[PDB]
Amino acid sequence: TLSILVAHDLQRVIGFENQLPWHLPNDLKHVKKLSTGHTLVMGRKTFESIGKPLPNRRNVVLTSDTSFNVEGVDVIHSIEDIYQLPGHVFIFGGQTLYEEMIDKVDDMYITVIEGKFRGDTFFPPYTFEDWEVASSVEGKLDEKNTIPHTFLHLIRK
Ligand SMILES: NC(=O)C1=CN([C@@H]2O[C@H](COP(=O)(O)OP(=O)(O)OC[C@H]3O[C@@H](n4cnc5c(N)ncnc54)[C@H](OP(=O)(O)O)[C@@H]3O)[C@@H](O)[C@H]2O)C=CC1
Numbered sequence: 199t200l201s202i203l204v205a206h207d208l209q210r211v212i213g214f215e216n217q218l219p220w221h222l223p224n225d226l227k228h229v230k231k232l233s234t235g236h237t238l239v240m241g242r243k244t245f246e247s248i249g250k251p252l253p254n255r256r257n258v259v260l261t262s263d264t265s266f267n268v269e270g271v272d273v274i275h276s277i278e279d280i281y282q283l284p285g286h287v288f289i290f291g292g293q294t295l296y297e298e299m300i301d302k303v304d305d306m307y308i309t310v311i312e313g314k315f316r317g318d319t320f321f322p323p324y325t326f327e328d329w330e331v332a333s334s335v336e337g338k339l340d341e342k343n344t345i346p347h348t349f350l351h352l353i354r355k
């Protein structure tokens with residue numbers, strides 16, 4: 199399976215100044231559950247802003263940098279290399295990779311953050327006429343998760 203995994207707000211903001219614009223522990227749990235034991239593919243910028251590989255899954259970084267080397271990270275140099283990766287692969291960001299991959303993925307795991315944040319990074323526009331709603335689950339609000347959010351699993355029609 200080739201999937202997108204993304205959290206975006208009401209205007210499809212995914213980032214601001216190399217950071218996530220929101221604090222949502224419930225969404226990190228969602229990511230952890232979905233991708234533990236599987237593969238995350240991300241662009242160089244997303245990885246650098248994270249800082250280190252995410253534990254207990256394969257971390258794959260796409261870059262043109264032939265010098266790129268991090269312990270616990272596998273490197274690829276073209277989109278085409280993605281399709282040779284075995285298992286369930288999640289496209290993890292950022293904007294450039296989503297733009298390159300949105301028309302290629304089987305399905306998308308989207309966390310819709312129900313707010314309007316300042317952003318400099320965006321998920322590409324998409325229509326629900328191309329995508330079936332496999333599931334839609336409202337995230338739970340509590341002390342540590344204070345922004346409304348909905349987990350969508352969308353499958354290409
Ligand atoms: N809310 C969310 O779900 C997530 C948020 N984000 C946010 O997005 C931001 C990063 O997005 P963005 O700025 O677009 O950067 P990206 O994460 O998409 O990385 C861009 C870099 O990836 C490499 N790359 C991309 N495509 C190719 C290719 N075809 N061949 C070789 N290398 C390639 C290049 O690296 P190089 O220049 O080294 O060659 C490029 O400069 C971050 O600020 C982050 O916070 C990201 C993912 C998820």
Ligand SMILES: CCc1nc(N)nc(N)c1C#CCc1cc(OC)ccc1OC
Pocket residue numbers: 203204205216217218225226228229244247248289290291307308309
């Ligand atoms: C955890 C944020 C997130 N959620 C979903 N649902 N999909 C994603 N692709 C992402 C992401 C991301 C990049 C990122 C992750 C991170 O986890 C510790 C920390 C920082 C990040 O970029 C600043």
